[PDB]
C-alpha cells in the first residue's frame, strides 16, 4: 500500500494500484480525463453532465455509461459497494457524515480542494484566504500531483502542471501597466442570480487578464445575489460559463438588466469551454482561459498570440482530440 496526504491534510492508505476509483467531484474528474486515467474509474458524481456541461461527453464518451453512486455532498453506499471501488475522491467540503459513510465500509477517501491556504478553511465550501492567488496556484499544482500519483500518471501530471502555468508570464508582462482604476469591471452571471464573490478562482482569472470581479469585495464565495446588487455594481462586461449557455439569452431578453453598462454595450459573452471561470482553478482555465479573456479585453496587446493553435496543441495533448467551438 501507499500513504498519501490529501487536501484536507488527511493521511490516507491506498492500494499500490488503482483501477476502480469512484470520482465524486467534477474538478478531479476533468483532471483525471486530462491525465488519460478514465480506464481506472468506475463511477462518477451523478451530476457530472450539469457540472461539466452538456458537451463534456464529447471529450470523454466513456462517461456516458459510467455508474453514479453519489454526487458532491451525498453518497449511496449500497450502490457504491457493488462497484468494488478501491478509492473515492470527494470534494473538500464533502460533509463529514458522507466521508464517515465511506470510511465505515473501509474504502479509502481522498479529498481534493485544488487549494492550499489556511488549514482551518480547507473544509469550507467558501473559504476566507489571505493569499488566494498563492493558495490556488499551489493548490492546483499539489492537487494535480496528488491525483496523478493515485492513478500512477506522474509524468503526464507534471506535463499538465507545466502546461497550466506556461502563459502566466506572458500575461503578467503584457498587462503589468494596467492600473486599478482601468482594470475592466466584470461580472460572472450563473443561473438564478448566482455569482462568485471572494475566495474563488473566478476573480483570479479576471485579475490575471486585466479585469476585476465586481462582486468580490462584498460577496463571499458562491452566492445568490439580487438584481439590485448587479445594477449597483453596473459591470462593464458580463461573462457566462460555457456549461450554462441559457444564461446569455435570459440576460439579453430580461428588461430588468437592460440599463446595465454591459447590456447597453453588448458585452455579454459566453466563455469558451476551456475558459472555466469557476470557483476552482482548472489547468486549461489558466493556460487557455486567461489568454482568451486577456485577448478579448486587450486585443491590440495580443495579436501575435495564436490562441487557436495554443488551444489545439493543448486539446490534442490532454484531451486526445481537437477543440470544437460551440
Ligand atoms: O464548478 Mo465550481 O464549484 O464553480 O469550480
Curated annotation (Swiss-Prot):
One of its GO terms (biological process) is cellular response to iron ion. The MolBCA complex shows a decrease in affinity in the presence of increasing concentrations of substrate and nucleotide. InterPro entries: ABC_Transporter_SBP, ABC_transptr_periplasmic_BD. Residues 20-301 form the Fe/B12 periplasmic-binding domain. Transmembrane segments: none annotated. It comes from the Bacteria. The keyword Ion transport applies. It is found in: Periplasm. Molybdate binds at residues 26-27, 196, 243, 279-280. Keywords: Ion transport, Molybdenum, Periplasm, Signal, Transport. One of its GO terms (cellular component) is periplasmic space. Pfam families: Peripla_BP_2. Part of the ABC transporter complex MolBCA involved in molybdate import. Functions as a low-affinity molybdate transporter. Binds to both molybdate and tungstate, but not to sulfate or phosphate. Belongs to the bacterial solute-binding protein 8 family. PANTHER family: MOLYBDATE-BINDING PROTEIN MOLA, VITAMIN B12-BINDING PROTEIN. Nucleotide binding is coupled to a conformational shift at the periplasmic gate. This shift is akin to unlocking a swinging door: allowing just enough space for molybdate to slip into the cell. The lower cytoplasmic gate, identified as gate I, remains open throughout the MolBC-A mechanism, and cytoplasmic gate II closes in the presence of nucleotide. The complex is composed of two ATP-binding proteins (MolC), two transmembrane proteins (MolB) and a solute-binding protein (MolA). This is Molybdate-binding protein MolA. It comes from Haemophilus influenzae (strain ATCC 51907 / DSM 11121 / KW20 / Rd).
Amino acid at each position: 500500500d501507499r500513504i498519501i496526504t490529501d487536501q484536507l491534510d488527511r493521511k490516507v492508505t491506498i492500494p499500490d494500484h488503482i483501477n476502480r476509483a469512484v470520482v465524486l467531484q467534477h474538478q478531479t474528474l476533468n483532471i483525471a480525463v486530462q491525465l488519460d486515467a478514465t480506464k481506472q474509474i468506475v463511477g462518477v458524481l451523478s451530476n457530472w453532465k450539469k457540472q461539466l456541461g452538456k458537451n463534456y461527453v464529447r471529450l470523454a464518451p466513456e462517461l456516458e455509461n459510467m455508474a453514479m453512486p453519489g454526487d458532491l455532498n451525498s453518497v449511496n453506499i449500497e450502490s457504491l459497494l457493488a462497484l468494488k471501488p478501491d478509492v473515492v475522491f470527494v470534494t473538500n467540503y464533502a460533509p463529514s457524515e458522507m466521508i464517515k459513510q465511506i470510511s465505515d465500509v473501509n474504502i479509502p477517501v481522498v479529498a481534493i480542494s485544488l487549494r492550499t491556504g489556511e488549514v482551518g478553511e480547507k473544509g469550507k465550501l467558501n473559504p476566507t484566504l489571505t493569499d488566494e492567488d498563492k493558495a490556488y496556484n499551489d493548490g492546483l499544482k499539489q492537487g494535480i500531483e496528488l491525483i496523478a500519483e493515485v492513478f500512477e500518471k506522474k509524468q503526464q501530471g507534471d506535463e499538465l502542471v507545466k502546461a497550466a502555468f506556461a502563459n502566466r508570464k506572458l500575461l503578467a508582462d503584457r498587462l503589468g501597466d494596467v492600473s486599478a482604476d482601468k482594470r475592466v469591471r466584470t461580472y460572472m452571471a450563473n443561473p438564478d442570480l448566482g455569482t462568485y464573490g471572494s475566495g474563488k478562482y473566478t476573480g483570479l482569472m479576471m485579475e490575471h487578464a486585466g479585469a476585476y470581479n465586481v462582486a468580490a469585495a462584498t460577496i463571499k464565495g458562491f452566492k445568490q445575489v439580487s438584481l439590485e446588487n448587479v445594477l449597483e455594481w453596473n459591470p462593464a462586461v458580463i461573462l457566462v460559463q460555457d456549461r450554462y449557455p441559457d444564461v446569455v439569452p435570459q440576460i439579453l431578453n430580461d428588461q430588468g438588466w437592460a440599463n446595465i453598462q454591459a447590456l447597453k454595450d453588448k458585452k455579454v459573452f459566453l466563455m469558451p469551454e476551456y475558459a472555466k471561470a469557476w470557483g476552482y482553478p482548472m489547468p486549461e482555465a489558466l493556460a487557455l482561459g486567461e489568454v482568451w479573456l486577456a485577448k478579448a479585453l486587450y486585443p491590440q496587446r495580443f495579436q501575435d498570440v495564436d490562441l487557436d493553435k495554443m488551444v489545439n496543441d493543448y486539446y490534442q495533448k490532454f484531451y486526445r482530440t481537437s477543440y470544437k467551438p460551440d
